Design a protein around this ligand. Structure first.
Ligand SMILES: [Cl-]
Ligand SMILES: [Cl-]
Lengths: 233, 220, 216
């Protein structure tokens, strides 16, 4: 009989709050179970919209002024840790497989709308421990934002490392560790990942033999190639 | 030494399950989600925690005598998965197909957590032609190949006889006979090599199966 | 040896164990003769398994370290773990008549495999001789090895260096470098790491400052 901060019952969540000023706003979820929110700090906010499916989702807030927003009609599992003033945003109609992990440290991790994130995907925006230049003696591995654009397919067993942007329509191959930006409409793979194909776009339906066979693919295709013009180095 | 190790879930018509006398086998499953599919397992095969799923029609999976298998085989839309004689396959094995073929030869040593991914699972298109460009492609593992642990072999790849795939590899291009390859993506790291199963073999002649294949490979 | 269950299957095997701290659920198997396991004072062993296969193996874990995982010392191998080194769950050491050493003050993350032996022989087809004999692994003092890493045979990693998440290391890594990839490559030179997340300068962390001074 757990309730969110506005007194709305959320039978799929357990909430533990060790700080002050924290807010959990939760819509009418679908097919959800075994979720947890842990506030280990103050003035944090978790927003989960109507028609989101959360299954075995754990959201942990470390420190203060963190913000996590999960947009409507998405499907999510895994562990999201928002640390020391980080923002984590997951867009509409995005699906995320089991084994998902987000790691932050006063930085931002964003996933656009209409993404397909496979199982065991790690978005690691912080290294966890400091690395320094031996001559300047200053830290050189500060956390850096990860930005996954709308309509990206991230394959199974992939890590995306700090400071990486992945452009719209792109595909990250199984097993990749991505350490550098991937432009729009490209396929990348490897450890470290490299661009392996340019001028591509993906679709969810296995039935589609042409771009026009899938509504969403066609929509993004028109947006990225006709209404706009992309040409990379 | 073990009868009745398979459960059958048949949701179609014309499906065939032909099983020889298995050994040391348990907890196996075959599921037919389609029609006119066939699973044949020969005598003296060991299957443990093997799940074979058929999707669509006209698929064919055959496991030859004296092999040992675990894991998950999914044969989709008229695919053929064939495993040769005396081949051993570790836990965590995965096969993925789509109207294509995946073959493993005789006398192979396939370690744990090996994925043979002949199909990408979702389509990718060229933005200019608008046509799909990632159609499934056959995977062919020749006889007497050692595939190390935690390896994926991707679509369209052939691995030649006597070769070795290193731990943790993702193999995206053909590997010729008698080579060692490793990496992600994998590259050839050594040529003119062959492997053996027993760890006290100091010379090729110390192991009969190694000696046999070495002879065939260096003569042909 | 309260936190240890010992299965001794040979002659002349010795287990010397100091006053452990916070230790539990450990196991040792002596599957051979004349093996030695030595664990110093104030070591934390939790779900550690040490297996000795064959004879004349030696495993020593030095004081004030923390260890988990599985160590297999085979056919006259030596495995040494230095002082004040921390090792995460999923650790594995594989040997065959060779040496694996981790130095002092190391930070070894979860799921790190030190594989000094291939497990099966590979031969040159022309000489017919084996060409993948086991080769020693040396991790120097003050190294951070990231999560889900394998270090393969014959590799040395220099002091102060960092191995990135998910790496497979197949060649030596010099001192004060960061390496990552499969196979791993050097990605940055002239670096050093610290454990404390707060440190913004090398001088913010005692241990970091100490090695930085001695290494430069
Ligand atoms: Cl439910
Ligand atoms: Cl937003």
């Amino acid at each position: 009989k757990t309730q969110d901060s506005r007194l709305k019952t959320q039978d799929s969540f357990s909430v533990d709050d060790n700080g002050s000023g924290n807010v959990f706003v939760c819509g009418d979820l679908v097919n959800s179970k075994e979720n947890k929110v842990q506030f280990n700090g103050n003035n944090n906010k978790l927003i989960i919209e109507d028609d989101v499916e959360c299954r075995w989702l754990t959201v942990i807030f470390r420190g203060d002024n963190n913000y996590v927003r999960i947009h409507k009609n998405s499907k999510i599992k895994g562990d999201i840790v928002a640390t020391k003033g980080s923002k984590v945003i997951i867009g509409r109609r995005t699906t995320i497989g089991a084994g998902f992990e987000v790691v932050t440290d006063k930085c931002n991790v964003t996933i656009g709308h209409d993404c397909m994130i496979a199982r065991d995907v790690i978005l690691r925006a912080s290294d966890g421990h400091p690395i320094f230049d031996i001559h300047s003696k200053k830290r050189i591995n500060w956390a850096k934002d990860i930005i996954i654009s709308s309509y990206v397919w991230v394959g199974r067993n992939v890590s995306i490392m700090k400071g990486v942007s992945v452009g719209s329509g792109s595909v990250i191959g199984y097993g990749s560790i991505v350490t550098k930006d991937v432009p729009s409409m490209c396929a990348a793979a490897g450890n470290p990942a490299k661009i392996i194909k340019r001028n591509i776009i993906w679709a969810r339906t296995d039935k589609a033999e042409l771009i026009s066979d899938d509504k969403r693919c066609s929509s993004y295709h028109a947006k990225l190639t006709q209404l706009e013009h992309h040409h990379h180095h």
